[PDB]
Amino acid sequence: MTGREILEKLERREFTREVLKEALSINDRGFNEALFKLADEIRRKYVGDEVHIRAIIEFSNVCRKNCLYCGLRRDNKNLKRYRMTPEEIVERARLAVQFGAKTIVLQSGEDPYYMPDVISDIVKEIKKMGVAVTLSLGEWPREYYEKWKEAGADRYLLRHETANPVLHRKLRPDTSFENRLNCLLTLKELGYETGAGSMVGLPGQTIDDLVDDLLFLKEHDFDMVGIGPFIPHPDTPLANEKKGDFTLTLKMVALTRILLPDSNIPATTAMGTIVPGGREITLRCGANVIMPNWTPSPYRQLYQLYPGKICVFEKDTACIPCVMKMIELLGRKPGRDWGGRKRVFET
Ligand SMILES: C[C@H](CCC(=O)NCCC[N+](C)(C)CCCS(=O)(=O)[O-])[C@H]1CC[C@H]2[C@@H]3[C@H](O)C[C@@H]4C[C@H](O)CC[C@]4(C)[C@H]3C[C@H](O)[C@]12C
Ligand SMILES: C[C@H](CCC(=O)NCCC[N+](C)(C)CCCS(=O)(=O)[O-])[C@H]1CC[C@H]2[C@@H]3[C@H](O)C[C@@H]4C[C@H](O)CC[C@]4(C)[C@H]3C[C@H](O)[C@]12C
Ligand SMILES: Nc1ncnc2c1ncn2[C@@H]1O[C@H](CSCC[C@H](N)C(=O)O)[C@@H](O)[C@H]1O
Ligand code: SF4
Ligand code: FES
Ligand SMILES: [C-]#N
Ligand SMILES: [Fe+2]
Ligand SMILES: [S]
Ligand SMILES: [S]
């Protein structure tokens, strides 16, 4: 179809596989800009001008899994491993709340040391501060997810990475897409606000795979969707592969907003790493959430999912003020509440 015809169908919410594939296959600048403008408008209409700040504390880089893309994979001996103590984590979260953070995100490698009871105790302490808590700890038994929900966790970010089961198993040899999806369904059933999302430009991933990622996100109606480019890490088996394309990833963000108009969608760290100013662009093409790095030195530099990760060289209180300045210069507004999903029921 022509680009104009594709945009017309997107505006009429006729989200067929062919429409999504054509949107991802057209590279015309005029089409792309019109797609970004549509997503920006849908974002404004459904979720408004507030940009929600989620302060991330990457509290351990120990991991039991061996994902082929990830710098924290267990086979990487070229990385100093660290673990923050529970007291350090709680006090670091307290500092973020003192700086105005309304959500605390705890993210780590799949580090067994904390699971499940240390996490539960940390969550209970942070919840006393009157903020939302999001966990991003990987794949664990239902019993652990249950304990963390009873302890007060509000949300769970478990990006699905890729909806292609063959590619998923090759890149994540300890597990499977089937288990990842089961974890996501369990999280939803337990009442978490649940986040999924994929990487764009993985080795062997096709445009059809990206369409499947979009249809997967639409099918399950996730509360949050985290999308970013694949960034090769020199100490992994994918060191020599090509990085994901920023524009194609941006189109995935924009189409996700169009498909899931009331969802929460971050402008990911990876988007800011791949292109200078990438997060600001993404906030203008469908995203409405930003997640400043709140990991303290000397650990911030060691959470090396991929190289070149932004904000490693800044003072460790720098990122919350920085994103507040970013939101203001974008003409946007601070989030006033926890920024939970506000469902607009449609037809
Ligand atoms: C800032 C630059 C180009 C600068 C420019 O060229 N214009 C700025 C003011 C100049 N004026 C036209 C007002 C004066 C003309 C008189 S003059 O004689 O000086 O030319 C423009 C050109 C293309 C624009 C992006 C695309 O749309 C896609 C997307 C749409 C979303 O919704 C918002 C985000 C995003 C990324 C846009 C952001 C921004 O907006 C861009 C980069
Ligand atoms: C942590 C220390 C010491 C005092 C303290 O421990 N303060 C707790 C505040 C708790 N809250 C944020 C929930 C209050 C919000 C009240 S508010 O009126 O904003 O709704 C206080 C003293 C001055 C405060 C900064 C400045 O102000 C400027 C700026 C305002 C933004 O906005 C938030 C970010 C920033 C950088 C502030 C961060 C932080 O806060 C500072 C460093
Ligand atoms: N090389 C790379 N490039 C871009 N993103 C990467 C990456 N390696 C890992 N990531 C992203 O980092 C995210 C958090 S990894 C930490 C949380 C948890 N261990 C988990 O796997 O869910 C992953 O979901 C993945 O999408
Ligand atoms: S993506 Fe998550 S589970 Fe996989 S190696 Fe990295 S930290 Fe471990
Ligand atoms: S958000 Fe980290 S220094 Fe700007
Ligand atoms: C992630 N931001
Ligand atoms: Fe993230
Ligand atoms: S930062
Ligand atoms: S920033």
UniProtKB/Swiss-Prot annotation:
Gene3D superfamilies: Aldolase class I (3.20.20.70). Its EC number is 1.8.-.-. It comes from the Bacteria. One of its GO terms (biological process) is sulfur compound biosynthetic process. Its cofactor is [4Fe-4S] cluster; [2Fe-2S] cluster. [2Fe-2S] cluster binds at C311, C319, C322. The keyword Nucleotidyltransferase does not apply. [4Fe-4S] cluster binds at C63, C67, C70. Belongs to the radical SAM superfamily. HydE family. This is [FeFe] hydrogenase maturase subunit HydE.
